[model samples]
Every structure is written in structure tokens, then in C-alpha cells.
Target: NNIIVGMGEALWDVLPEGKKIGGAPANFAYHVSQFGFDSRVVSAVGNDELGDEIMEVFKEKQLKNQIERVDYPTGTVQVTPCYEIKEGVAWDNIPFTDELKRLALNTRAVCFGSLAQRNEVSRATINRFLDTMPDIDGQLKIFDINLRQDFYTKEVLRESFKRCNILKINDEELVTISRMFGYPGIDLQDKCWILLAKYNLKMLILTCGINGSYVFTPGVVSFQETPKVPVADTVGAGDSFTAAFCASILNGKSVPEAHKLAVEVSAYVCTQSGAMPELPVILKDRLL
Candidate 1:
């Protein structure tokens, strides 16, 4: 099986009362592996107990171990009572090394985000690897704009879009991006087209939470509605959606079919306790 590579921060996301393994790339890789893809995650972890525990959990889940150990402490995000105001997250200190670049080269797609690149170290590392990415015929470069208010800027977002073959953003992210790019209307489809055109991107995926999702390609436009399910926590819902969508694409499904499956898989995740715990057995079973 071809491996999907996720590059970003790996850390404990501290919620109001507790903690969870909740970085976007890490969550995406976890769900991607659950979907039967050989998913490998590349990130820097501190040489601390929390980092050791993360590795232990990864082994237990049967996820690929391409994680790098950093000299600095493991990255952590302290979530506020309302799940906002994330501060002093550990991922900002990710150190890039030759080993991680080698691991990235062996993957089918490289999944990344601007949030992880907010810091200079991670940004430089990501740029270095991206610069040398192999020119495989069908290789995909996925950019999930997991934008948090404190970490995003127009210039940075534009640069990231320029390097991505596929772009994924949530509905609110689409509106926010449109505003960043100085678009006039609130129509998401229009904004999507504009961004896609601006970046000459191959595909654009717009996720609208329970309202569903939209996929825009060269001549195809597809929309899918989320399955109605009891919500557990919306924490990793979007990451689950991205993993499903990426898995569908890697398995040779059309954008429309992939979008539908993405919604279904995400709905399943929404009904579960944690991000990666609720993955459906197989693609077909997930849809059913």
C-alpha cells in the first residue's frame, strides 16, 4: 500500500479539564491509517514523558513511526475553557533533520498546514522538504488550511496555497480566506473558484461541518451532506474528514465519490469518543 505522509506538530492538546492527542496532521495520519492506508507521520517530539507516551500510543494504534525526536521539550497546546485561546503550543519548536526528509520522500502524498509553519523552525524545515519533493507523476501535495486565529496571515496563507496541488478548508475558513484575499461576495463556491484559479490548484475541498462539503475540480463541482449522527465532540471531525477524503483519492475514487465518503466517515467519527477511535472498518462499510 502507498503511504500517506503527514507533517506538522505532534502534541498533547490540553482541553478544559484534560488532554488528548490532537494535532491536525497527527489526527489525520491516525484516521488515514485506520482506513487501511500506510500512513506515516513526521513531526518533532520533545524528549520528555509526554513524547514517550505519544510514541507508545502510536505503537498501540499500529501507526507508522516516522516521528523525529527534538532536543527541545515536546510541543503542547493549552486549550482554554471554551476551547479557544490555545497558547505556547509545543509544535512551534519542531526541528528539521535529514531523516524526516527521507521519510517524506517515500510517501504518496504529503499533508501539511500553515498552522504548523507559523514558527520559523518548522517553516524552514517544511520549505526545505517541499523544495526537494520528488516529481512523481501522480504525487499529491495536500494543504489543509487548519487555520487558527492566532497563527494565520494573508501572506503566509498565499504562499502555502501556491505550493499545494490540493487545498482543503472548512466553510468558515473559506469565508475567512475570501476576506483575506479581498473577495467581495459571501458565496463559498465563488470564493473557492477564485482561490483555486489564483493558485492553479488541481482540486479544492470545502468542508461545511454538518451542512456537508463541496469539491471543486477543473470541470466538476460536487457537494455532499454529512450524515446525521449524535455529536460526541467536534474536535477531530474535520481532521477525520480530511483523512477520509485523502484516502478516497489515493484509492482512485473520483472527487465526487470521495467527497461523499469523506462526509460519511466524518459522521462516524463525530459519534465516537476520540478522533481516531471511531474509524469505520473499511471504505464500503463506512459508507453503509
Candidate 2:
């Protein structure tokens, strides 16, 4: 059974104009499910109306019933025009519970991040889950450095990186991590290699929106150029790419083949309006 678990903020991305059920873990699980994997999301949401709506959306989409609802209001991220300033409004209040431990134990890969760990409740819970993970035999532990500026510190990065088997970050984040680690070079990939080598990670995926993407593994390195498409907001492309990449790997595709499919799936996403809605057909065609 191919199973993937995502641990992070699961919330609605609220804009001044409207709201959408998003957050990287939700997006990742949605796309991976589309690829025929048994994907489950492990995150906390509030018991409010919006949170209830998010749960309904998950059921409507046919995601597994693994999402936990806590007494706190559902987690929400307030998105502003400036991407860097987007705040995880309600996710910071996620409640930790033993149920999350059972979910993590069944997964083949657990995707987590530093931003989700900033709050002590979620942090302690994730730490406990990580401690319970079986050793690095066949299970893959992905640490997506979805670094939202104010939510991270050097200590957080070091601790998360030390535990991951794979790391995924964007171009800007690569540079930031490089500087944070005091790497000698100015080139983002070189700096990324420094951290990748230090952690002895099995793979590193670096994505640059319009420029392209790069995948580095211990034995091979592959690159994929973005397919040109008229941009609909670049909201969930990276998450789409990560989902496709992991799905391909789990389905037994090579790194280069997986990267190619990842670029294709993400390109299709750029043409659609919402993130999860765009996933199904493209992923079905690719995997089936």
C-alpha cells in the first residue's frame, strides 16, 4: 500500500475578497490522492463554521478521514498582496493529541515543515511523532521548508533539517537557508548542496517559479524547465509540484521521470482557478 501523510497547517487561505481551503498539506494530499495514492492529512482545525466547511470539502474531495478538529477555531492563513507577510491566523492554535501519533505511524512518508513547528503545541506534537517514526529503511520523511519569514529561526531550521530524509524549498528559501547556515557561496544551488550534504538528505528539490526546478538525489541530479502558460495566480504550484514528485517516486518512477511529470502537473495547475479542483484530471491521466 502506498501511503503518504502530510503534517502541517491545514486551513483556509482568506483574502480580503474571499476564502479558499488551502495550506500546503491539504494541497499536497489532494494532488497525491489524485495520483491514486492513499494520502492522508494530519493537522488540526477549529470547530468553527469555516472549519466545518473545510472538513466538508475534504469529504467531498474523497480524502481520507484523518483530519482532526480541535476546540480552537479552524486554522486560517490571512493572505495579503505581499506573499511574505501572509499569516497563519488560526493554524498557530492547533491542538496536539495522541490521535495524530497513530496516523503518523501508518504513513509511508511524512511531510512536515518548520512553519508548522513554530507553535509549541504543534511543535511538541510533531517532535513526539518524529520520535516514533521507524528508522530510515523504506519510509521517506520530507521536510518542506515552506518558510514564512516571521515564523522561523535558525534553531528551528537546524532541528527540522536534522530529522528529514528529503528537503524541498523554493529559490528564495534556498538562498535564505544558505545564508542562515553560513555557506561560503552566493549561488543558491551551491548553498543548497551545502545543507543537503550536511544533513545527508536523500533528495533536495529546489523550485523557481518561472525559471524552472531542480531535483538532486545522492546518485543523480535532474532539472526541468517550466512549461510556459498564462499565469493564473501562482498560489499552489509548488505544492502541486511536490505532490506530483512524491507520487511519481512512490509509484516507482526515476528522479528524471518524476521531475518531468511534476513540471507537467504543475503547468496544468497554473491554468486552473483553484488548487485542489485542478488536480484530479491531470493526475489521473498521468498515473492511470
- Which residue pairs in candidate 2 have backbone atoms (N, alpha carbon, C) closer than 3 angstroms, thus clashing? 46-73, 46-74, 75-91
Q: Taking the tens digit of each residue's C-alpha lDDT, what string does model 1 give over 23-119? A: 7887888888777777877787777899898898889877786777767777777777444423344466565677766765666877899888887
Candidate 2 per-residue C-alpha lDDT over 1-288 given as tens digits, one digit per residue, 9 for 90 to 100? 256877788777778889887778878887787787788877877768987898888888887756666667776667785543234434665555677666656678778888888877777777777777764566788888898767898888888888888899888887777777776477666776776788998789988877988998765679888889987766677787888888887777888888998898888788888777556564567655
What TM-score does each of the candidates earn?
A: 0.91, 0.91
Each model's lDDT comes to 0.77, 0.77
lDDT accuracy of residue 223 in candidate 2: 86
Q: Evaluate model 1: give its lDDT.
A: 0.77
Please list all clashing residue pairs in model 1, or write none if there are none.
Answer: 46-74, 75-90, 76-90
